[PDB]
Amino acid sequence: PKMKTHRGAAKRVKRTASGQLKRSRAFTSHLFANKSTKQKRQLRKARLVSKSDMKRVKQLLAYK
Amino acid sequence: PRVKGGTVTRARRKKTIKLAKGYFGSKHTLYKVAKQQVMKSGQYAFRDRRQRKRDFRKLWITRINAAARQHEMSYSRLMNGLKKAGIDINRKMLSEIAISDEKAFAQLVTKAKDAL
Amino acid sequence: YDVLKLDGTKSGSIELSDAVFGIEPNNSVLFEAINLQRASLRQGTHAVKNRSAVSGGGRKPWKQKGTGRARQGTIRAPQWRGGGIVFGPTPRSYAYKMPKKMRRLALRSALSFKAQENGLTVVDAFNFEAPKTKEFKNVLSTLEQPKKVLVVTENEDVNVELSARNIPGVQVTTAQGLNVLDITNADSLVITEAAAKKVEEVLG
Amino acid sequence: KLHELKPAEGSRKERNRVGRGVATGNGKTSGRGHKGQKARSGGGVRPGFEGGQLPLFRRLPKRGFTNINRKEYAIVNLDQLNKFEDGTEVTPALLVESGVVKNEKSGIKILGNGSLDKKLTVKAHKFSASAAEAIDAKGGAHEV
RNA sequence: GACAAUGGUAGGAGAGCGUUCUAAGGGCGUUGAAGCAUGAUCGUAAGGACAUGUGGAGCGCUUAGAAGUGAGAAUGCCGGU
RNA sequence: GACCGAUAGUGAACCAGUACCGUGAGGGAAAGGUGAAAAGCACCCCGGAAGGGGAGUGAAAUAGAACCUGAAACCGUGUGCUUACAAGUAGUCAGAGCCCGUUAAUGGGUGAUGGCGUGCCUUUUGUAGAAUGAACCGGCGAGUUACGAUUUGAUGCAAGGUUAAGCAGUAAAUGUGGAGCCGUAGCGAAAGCGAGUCUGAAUAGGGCGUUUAGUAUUUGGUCGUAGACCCGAAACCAGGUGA
RNA sequence: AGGACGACAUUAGACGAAUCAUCUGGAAAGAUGAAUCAAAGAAGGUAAUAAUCCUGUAGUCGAAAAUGUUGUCUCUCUUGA
Numbered sequence: 012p013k014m015k016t017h018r019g020a021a022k023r024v025k026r027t028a029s030g031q032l033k034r035s036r037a038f039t040s041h042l043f044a045n046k047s048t049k050q051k052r053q054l055r056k057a058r059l060v061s062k063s064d065m066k067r068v069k070q071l072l073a074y075k
Numbered sequence: 076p077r078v079k080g081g082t083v084t085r086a087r088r089k090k091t092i093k094l095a096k097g098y099f100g101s102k103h104t105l106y107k108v109a110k111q112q113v114m115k116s117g118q119y120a121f122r123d124r125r126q127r128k129r130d131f132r133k134l135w136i137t138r139i140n141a142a143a144r145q146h147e148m149s150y151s152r153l154m155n156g157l158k159k160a161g162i163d164i165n166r167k168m169l170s171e172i173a174i175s176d177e178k179a180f181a182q183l184v185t186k187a188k189d190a191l
Numbered sequence: 192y193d194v195l196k197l198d199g200t201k202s203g204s205i206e207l208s209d210a211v212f213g214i215e216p217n218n219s220v221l222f223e224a225i226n227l228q229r230a231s232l233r234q235g236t237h238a239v240k241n242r243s244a245v246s247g248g249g250r251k252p253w254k255q256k257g258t259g260r261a262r263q264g265t266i267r268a269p270q271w272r273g274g275g276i277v278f279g280p281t282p283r284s285y286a287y288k289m290p291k292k293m294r295r296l297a298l299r300s301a302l303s304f305k306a307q308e309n310g311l312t313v314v315d316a317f318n319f320e321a322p323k324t325k326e327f328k329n330v331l332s333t334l335e336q337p338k339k340v341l342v343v344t345e346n347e348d349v350n351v352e353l354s355a356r357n358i359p360g361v362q363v364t365t366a367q368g369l370n371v372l373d374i375t376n377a378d379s380l381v382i383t384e385a386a387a388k389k390v391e392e393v394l395g
Numbered sequence: 396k397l398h399e400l401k402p403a404e405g406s407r408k409e410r411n412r413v414g415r416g417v418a419t420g421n422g423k424t425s426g427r428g429h430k431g432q433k434a435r436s437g438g439g440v441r442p443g444f445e446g447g448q449l450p451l452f453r454r455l456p457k458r459g460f461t462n463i464n465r466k467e468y469a470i471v472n473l474d475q476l477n478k479f480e481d482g483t484e485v486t487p488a489l490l491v492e493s494g495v496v497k498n499e500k501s502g503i504k505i506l507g508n509g510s511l512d513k514k515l516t517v518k519a520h521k522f523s524a525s526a527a528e529a530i531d532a533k534g535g536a537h538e539v
Numbered sequence: 540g541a542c543a544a545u546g547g548u549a550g551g552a553g554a555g556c557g558u559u560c561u562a563a564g565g566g567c568g569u570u571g572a573a574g575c576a577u578g579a580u581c582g583u584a585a586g587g588a589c590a591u592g593u594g595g596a597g598c599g600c601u602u603a604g605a606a607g608u609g610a611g612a613a614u615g616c617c618g619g620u
Numbered sequence: 621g622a623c624c625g626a627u628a629g630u631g632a633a634c635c636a637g638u639a640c641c642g643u644g645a646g647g648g649a650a651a652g653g654u655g656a657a658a659a660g661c662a663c664c665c666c667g668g669a670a671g672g673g674g675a676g677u678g679a680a681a682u683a684g685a686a687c688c689u690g691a692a693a694c695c696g697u698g699u700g701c702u703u704a705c706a707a708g709u710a711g712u713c714a715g716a717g718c719c720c721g722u723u724a725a726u727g728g729g730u731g732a733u734g735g736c737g738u739g740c741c742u743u744u745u746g747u748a749g750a751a752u753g754a755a756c757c758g759g760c761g762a763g764u765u766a767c768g769a770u771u772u773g774a775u776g777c778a779a780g781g782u783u784a785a786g787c788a789g790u791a792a793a794u795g796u797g798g799a800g801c802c803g804u805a806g807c808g809a810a811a812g813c814g815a816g817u818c819u820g821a822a823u824a825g826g827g828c829g830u831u832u833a834g835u836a837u838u839u840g841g842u843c844g845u846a847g848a849c850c851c852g853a854a855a856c857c858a859g860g861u862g863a
Numbered sequence: 864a865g866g867a868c869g870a871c872a873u874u875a876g877a878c879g880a881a882u883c884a885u886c887u888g889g890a891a892a893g894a895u896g897a898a899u900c901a902a903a904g905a906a907g908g909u910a911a912u913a914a915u916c917c918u919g920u921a922g923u924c925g926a927a928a929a930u931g932u933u934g935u936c937u938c939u940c941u942u943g944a
């Protein structure tokens with residue numbers, strides 16, 4: 012049998028043009044009165060899945 | 076293809092038993108008992124090539140010491156002068172001179188007292 | 192491509208060679224189109240039991256605790272005298288493919304080793320009415336051919352290949368039925384004129 | 396010949412058989428270490444499982460959707476059109492057959508990265524803005 | 540030919556001996572093969588020969604391929620004492 | 621048939637689901653080989669007979685139905701050196717005295733006396749351990765294959781590489797088969813725009829890009845789905861047999 | 864929805880080419896010598912390892928009979944836009 016893509020991770024992640032992934036920042040759901048305006052604004056830009064956590068998920072994202 | 080266990084457990088368990096002939100009782104007949112005596116009789120020999128060189132020196136010094144005391148000199152007064160009076164090269168295996176020719180060993184004792 | 196022969200002869204000596212009989216042969220491809228052929232002739236019908244295919248052995252043999260001897264689970268286990276084979280042969284299959292630019296380079300490196308070594312001989316189209324091996328052994332003696340030759344003909348005539356089957360060494364293959372294991376098994380190659388224009392029309 | 400075959404130099408390799416000695420290294424424990432979960436026959440935990448702590452992908456939010464229809468166009472730059480030499484019209488019955496476009500999805504877009512260096516009758520489903528100018532510089536045409 | 544390095548368990552890397560089988564080239568064998576037994580031999584190691592005895596018909600060597608490929612222990616399993 | 625060759629391959633090469641165990645359903649092993657040809661030992665002798673030793677058949681009975689070759693453990697009979705004042709993980713290195721004579725090389729067997737020396741694995745911060753395991757000898761007994769994934773080594777071409785099922789062909793490894801797939805162009809949640817694009821009133825500033833090498837088969841490593849290195853539970857459920 | 868006449872296949876079977884003499888041996892198929900057949904050098908046995916000793920193989924050849932597969936000959940049946 013051929014490998015199945017982790018479907019809970021393809022919904023959360025795109026693939027760029029150097030192999031490195033792309034994610035959205037956490038804490039963007041509720042309780043926006045306990046966060047500053049210098050903090051609610053910088054949980055909006057997007058970042059890249061880190062070098063540590065790319066070592067764990069090499070097999071789960073193979074067809075992206 | 077099925078590789079049957081052939082004639083390699085004959086030969087490998089002979090060339091250990093044949094090294095171990097001359098041992099007491101069952102240590103020359105059984106495999107497991109004569110195996111692990113061969114591993115120790117090549118380990119005892121490894122520290123007995125290193126020990127042989129330094130326990131024939133605890134004998135040559137004993138003979139020289141029992142040669143200078145009859146000429147009334149210590150050993151430690153004898154391998155002092157022969158480094159300092161002459162440049163008589165350091166040799167203790169050649170305490171064979173003291174056994175063989177006492178007339179030859181006497182002139183060294185003359186040269187040791189001469190410049191000490 | 193030396194000249195020609197009939198049985199001690201010459202004719203219009205064809206010379207118009209191509210990149211089929213002249214390329215410097217690589218051996219990295221020629222070694223790896225023999226293993227693709229020598230390891231595809233094996234059928235691989237070979238198998239063995241495992242713990243679930245032997246007959247019996249489901250009752251626990253009454254040895255758990257309170258008997259003084261070892262813990263044992265079935266009487267069909269790889270420790271045990273009877274069946275149960277851990278990692279045995281399975282019925283598998285041995286074949287793989289290779290690029291089509293690398294299967295055409297192989298015949299340009301096995302034909303190309305025959306003209307470097309003068310192991311090629313072109314003859315005219317010989318016609319046997321009835322097949323006789325005694326008629327055919329008078330041919331290869333005066334042609335000075337070695338113990339093992341590969342006879343190339345254009346189309347499989349039903350009188351050429353029926354002779355020369357019991358001559359040990361001699362195999363008779365048509366023009367598009369050439370292999371790589373055959374050509375590096377022969378010692379000198381004998382091609383008809385009507386087929387030397389045919390295997391070259393395929394490749395060059 | 397066949398009684399003497401050599402492989403390619405540096406192409407082949409032995410294989411490690413574990414557990415079959417003591418001086419080969421991989422022996423009496425086969426290269427796993429001592430006790431634990433992942434030194435058991437079939438142990439080792441599923442990938443992307445941190446151990447009980449919530450994983451990476453249950454700590455990020457989901458984002459996006461599909462757009463079921465989603466047209467896709469095949470890319471031809473202007474640098475890839477110097478392959479056509481002599482005054483040639485550039486037709487989707489020609490731009491596929493040479494080998495420029497292989498197996499297009501929908502109509503051919505003509506982007507501008509290189510230069511044509513030749514006048515050409517160009518027909519394409521969608522031009523861009525910068526490639527419908529370097530065609531007009533040499534003198535060309537359009538059709539949508 | 541100088542100057543250098545070389546204890547080592549978990550573990551990473553390299554280089555080799557051997558066993559059954561197949562393909563190709565060469566070869567020994569009833570003027571006696573394999574197997575077994577004795578020996579004071581050869582290589583840095585696994586391992587290779589050769590010399591008499593028993594044995595009574597099949598076996599090695601060079602290059603490459605493929606593995607049911609190597610046993611001192613699992614209160615391991617059957618047989619013998 | 622790059623499958624096995626009597627602990628193997630069927631449980632079964634022997635008159636096998638048979639001796640034997642169970643009230644019952646049900647469980648279940650052990651066994652092969654004289655010689656080319658029975659020419660399978662006439663007759664004498666010790667014996668109550670077995671079993672022997674001669675004579676005979678045979679290439680050989682030192683192949684006699686305990687019947688091819690005949691390993692080790694273990695029990696014997698013979699003989700060169702040695703031991704009845706000594707505290708021994710049984711060896712090692714130094715060495716007198718004695719009896720021998722090989723694959724000829726600064727040889728072999730034996731060992732009065734002296735020095736050093738608390739077995740082997742497995743688990744441990746640490747085992748002579750009075751912690752675990754094996755009576756001994758012999759066989760058997762554990763990282764394997766498949767279809768995918770990724771990196772490394774090779775090789776063929778290289779802005780291009782390559783076929784899948786199928787049909788012809790010697791269970792041929794080789795010709796057709798371009799459906800398909802990965803690359804040549806990214807960016808955004810998406811419309812879309814495109815060497816640029818998205819966020820933004822604004823290329824103002826920043827995110828990811830751009831000025832290049834890929835692909836197809838295979839050697840090795842490892843990961844995934846499969847019993848996945850092998851051995852061992854207490855127990856759960858489904859049909860059935862028993863007062 | 865109810866039959867005949869012979870074509871072919873299956874369950875018996877037949878033909879089927881070509882080596883003689885010495886050495887070692889208990890025995891020739893072996894090595895040393897001369898011969899031959901080959902649409903036949905696949906394989907097994909014969910006092911050891913046989914293309915030519917035997918049973919055979921490539922190839923032809925064969926059915927009193929009982930099934931089986933189909934061709935065309937009946938024979939049943941039919942209105943077409």
Ligand SMILES: [Mg+2]
């Ligand atoms: Mg004790």
Ligand SMILES: [Mg+2]
């Ligand atoms: Mg009652």
